[PDB]
Design an enzyme around this catalytic site. Structure first.
Site, PDB file in Angstrom:
ATOM      1  N   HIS A  62       4.314  19.898  -8.890  1.00 13.23           N
ATOM      2  CA  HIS A  62       2.851  20.021  -8.854  1.00 13.23           C
ATOM      3  C   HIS A  62       2.285  20.474 -10.201  1.00 13.23           C
ATOM      4  O   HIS A  62       1.068  20.656 -10.304  1.00 13.23           O
ATOM      5  CB  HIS A  62       2.375  20.967  -7.768  1.00 13.23           C
ATOM      6  CG  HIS A  62       2.936  22.353  -7.874  1.00 13.23           C
ATOM      7  ND1 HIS A  62       2.387  23.333  -8.656  1.00 13.23           N
ATOM      8  CD2 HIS A  62       4.008  22.920  -7.262  1.00 13.23           C
ATOM      9  CE1 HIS A  62       3.086  24.448  -8.546  1.00 13.23           C
ATOM     10  NE2 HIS A  62       4.081  24.220  -7.696  1.00 13.23           N
ATOM     11  N   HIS A  92       1.935  27.079 -17.574  1.00 14.28           N
ATOM     12  CA  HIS A  92       1.760  25.723 -17.046  1.00 14.28           C
ATOM     13  C   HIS A  92       0.316  25.319 -17.311  1.00 14.28           C
ATOM     14  O   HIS A  92      -0.490  26.153 -17.720  1.00 14.28           O
ATOM     15  CB  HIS A  92       2.062  25.637 -15.555  1.00 14.28           C
ATOM     16  CG  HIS A  92       1.271  26.637 -14.767  1.00 14.28           C
ATOM     17  ND1 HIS A  92       1.672  27.923 -14.457  1.00 14.28           N
ATOM     18  CD2 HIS A  92       0.035  26.482 -14.236  1.00 14.28           C
ATOM     19  CE1 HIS A  92       0.690  28.494 -13.742  1.00 14.28           C
ATOM     20  NE2 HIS A  92      -0.322  27.640 -13.592  1.00 14.28           N
ATOM     21  N   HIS A  94      -3.105  22.837 -15.648  1.00 10.10           N
ATOM     22  CA  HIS A  94      -3.775  22.073 -14.619  1.00 10.10           C
ATOM     23  C   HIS A  94      -4.632  21.050 -15.378  1.00 10.10           C
ATOM     24  O   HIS A  94      -5.269  21.414 -16.398  1.00 10.10           O
ATOM     25  CB  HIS A  94      -4.667  22.938 -13.730  1.00 10.10           C
ATOM     26  CG  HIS A  94      -3.919  24.061 -13.037  1.00 10.10           C
ATOM     27  ND1 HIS A  94      -3.514  23.997 -11.730  1.00 10.10           N
ATOM     28  CD2 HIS A  94      -3.507  25.259 -13.517  1.00 10.10           C
ATOM     29  CE1 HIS A  94      -2.876  25.142 -11.401  1.00 10.10           C
ATOM     30  NE2 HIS A  94      -2.875  25.896 -12.473  1.00 10.10           N
ATOM     31  N   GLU A 104      -9.779  24.605 -13.871  1.00 11.12           N
ATOM     32  CA  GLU A 104      -9.991  25.248 -12.561  1.00 11.12           C
ATOM     33  C   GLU A 104     -11.210  26.157 -12.637  1.00 11.12           C
ATOM     34  O   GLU A 104     -12.153  25.973 -11.850  1.00 11.12           O
ATOM     35  CB  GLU A 104      -8.730  25.984 -12.151  1.00 11.12           C
ATOM     36  CG  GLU A 104      -7.532  25.056 -12.087  1.00 11.12           C
ATOM     37  CD  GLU A 104      -6.463  25.607 -11.158  1.00 11.12           C
ATOM     38  OE1 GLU A 104      -5.909  26.679 -11.480  1.00 11.12           O
ATOM     39  OE2 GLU A 104      -6.193  24.969 -10.128  1.00 11.12           O
ATOM     40  N   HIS A 117      -2.420  28.157 -18.152  1.00 11.74           N
ATOM     41  CA  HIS A 117      -2.209  29.474 -17.535  1.00 11.74           C
ATOM     42  C   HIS A 117      -0.960  30.107 -18.138  1.00 11.74           C
ATOM     43  O   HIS A 117       0.156  29.593 -17.965  1.00 11.74           O
ATOM     44  CB  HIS A 117      -2.077  29.290 -16.023  1.00 11.74           C
ATOM     45  CG  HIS A 117      -3.387  28.967 -15.385  1.00 11.74           C
ATOM     46  ND1 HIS A 117      -3.524  28.536 -14.082  1.00 11.74           N
ATOM     47  CD2 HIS A 117      -4.620  29.069 -15.929  1.00 11.74           C
ATOM     48  CE1 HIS A 117      -4.821  28.365 -13.856  1.00 11.74           C
ATOM     49  NE2 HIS A 117      -5.490  28.668 -14.950  1.00 11.74           N
ATOM     50  N   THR A 196      -3.984  30.137  -8.124  1.00 10.88           N
ATOM     51  CA  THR A 196      -4.818  29.042  -7.644  1.00 10.88           C
ATOM     52  C   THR A 196      -4.017  27.983  -6.887  1.00 10.88           C
ATOM     53  O   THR A 196      -4.546  26.924  -6.536  1.00 10.88           O
ATOM     54  CB  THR A 196      -5.552  28.327  -8.794  1.00 10.88           C
ATOM     55  OG1 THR A 196      -4.543  27.789  -9.646  1.00 10.88           O
ATOM     56  CG2 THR A 196      -6.442  29.292  -9.590  1.00 10.88           C
ATOM     57  N   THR A 197      -2.739  28.236  -6.653  1.00  8.57           N
ATOM     58  CA  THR A 197      -1.912  27.365  -5.823  1.00  8.57           C
ATOM     59  C   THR A 197      -1.276  28.221  -4.720  1.00  8.57           C
ATOM     60  O   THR A 197      -1.142  29.444  -4.878  1.00  8.57           O
ATOM     61  CB  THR A 197      -0.790  26.668  -6.616  1.00  8.57           C
ATOM     62  OG1 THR A 197       0.117  27.706  -7.054  1.00  8.57           O
ATOM     63  CG2 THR A 197      -1.295  25.978  -7.866  1.00  8.57           C
TER      64      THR A 197
HETATM   65  O1  LIG Z   1      -1.805  31.927 -11.853  1.00  8.57           O
HETATM   66  C1  LIG Z   1       0.513  32.200 -11.570  1.00  8.57           C
HETATM   67  C2  LIG Z   1       1.729  31.638 -11.151  1.00  8.57           C
HETATM   68  C3  LIG Z   1       1.804  30.347 -10.667  1.00  8.57           C
HETATM   69  C4  LIG Z   1       0.666  29.525 -10.565  1.00  8.57           C
HETATM   70  C5  LIG Z   1      -0.548  30.096 -10.986  1.00  8.57           C
HETATM   71  C6  LIG Z   1      -0.623  31.395 -11.476  1.00  8.57           C
HETATM   72  S1  LIG Z   1      -2.029  29.166 -10.837  1.00  8.57           S
HETATM   73 ZN   LIG Z   2      -2.133  27.855 -12.676  1.00 12.16          ZN
END
Ligand SMILES: Oc1ccccc1S
Ligand SMILES: [Zn+2]
Length: 258
Positions: A62, A92, A94, A104, A117, A196-197
């Protein structure tokens, strides 16, 4: 079934398996710049990444994650609204199917093409797994991407994506320096929120940088060729892996700058 971002398992469905989706401190949110409060009590951020040790880059179905060694205080974040030391564990992105969407967080309803992020956990809790169970467990640096001139520091990432095209592929990714991804100024907004996931845990102190970085259209195009699926499965392109803005409820966005 497993959650995702399609019509049948996207954000509007997450609450059925993760009731915290409808929680009091969900993310992302829109940042109304006229209603955010300047807080002169807020300190400048301290990013200390000179000793970062990247290990691997992974397509997890994802997004793609770049993972770091977090067994020691090598790359850490302090200051800002934080108390304590937070260790970098992974970053990562988005992103969108089009240049006009992808982030986001939004700023006065404006969307950027993608959002970075950088995820850090509070070392008082001993490991990442324990930190995500705590209201001050994580601090996430959010950086906006806009399309314009290329970002040199992003190109090493872009180059390796074809080798992790499908879900579950990973590759060695050593000696990557994340300082190449920061904007020139560290002014920020901050509010308490969540992942946010899924599992959408309400454990994050968000730190959203005011200044976007620019990346080229060719660089974000390569993000859009990744796959949500696994090898040997029908191809679904990895695009629009963002969640819409959630209600702010009883929270105050604070700004580090006036
Ligand atoms: O914000 C931490 C870890 C994994 C995903 C997001 C944050 S979206
Ligand atoms: Zn994220």
């Amino acid at each position: 079934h497993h959650w995702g971002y399609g019509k049948h398992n996207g954000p509007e469905h997450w609450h059925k398996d993760f009731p915290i989706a409808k929680g009091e401190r969900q993310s992302p949110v829109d940042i109304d710049t006229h209603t955010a409060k300047y807080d002169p009590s807020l300190k400048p951020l301290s990013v200390s990444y000179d000793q970062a040790t990247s290990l691997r880059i992974l397509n997890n179905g994802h997004a793609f994650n770049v993972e770091f060694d977090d067994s020691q205080d090598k790359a850490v974040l302090k200051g800002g609204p934080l108390d304590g030391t937070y260790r970098l564990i992974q970053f990562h992105f988005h992103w969108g199917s089009l240049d006009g969407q992808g982030s986001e967080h939004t700023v006065d309803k404006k969307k950027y093409a993608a959002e970075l992020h950088l995820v850090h956990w509070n070392t008082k809790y001993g490991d990442f797994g324990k930190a995500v169970q705590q209201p001050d467990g994580l601090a996430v640096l959010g950086i906006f991407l806009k399309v314009g001139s290329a970002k040199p520091g992003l190109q090493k990432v872009v180059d390796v994506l074809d080798s992790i095209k499908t879900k579950g592929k990973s590759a060695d990714f050593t000696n990557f320096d994340p300082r190449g991804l920061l904007p020139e100024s560290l002014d920020y907004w901050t509010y308490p929120g969540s992942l946010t996931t899924p599992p959408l845990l309400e454990c994050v102190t968000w730190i959203v940088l005011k200044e976007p970085i620019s990346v080229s259209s060719e660089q974000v195009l390569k993000f859009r060729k990744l796959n949500f699926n696994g090898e040997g499965e029908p191809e679904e392109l990895m695009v629009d892996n963002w969640r819409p803005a959630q209600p702010l409820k009883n929270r105050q966005i604070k700004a580090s700058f006036k």
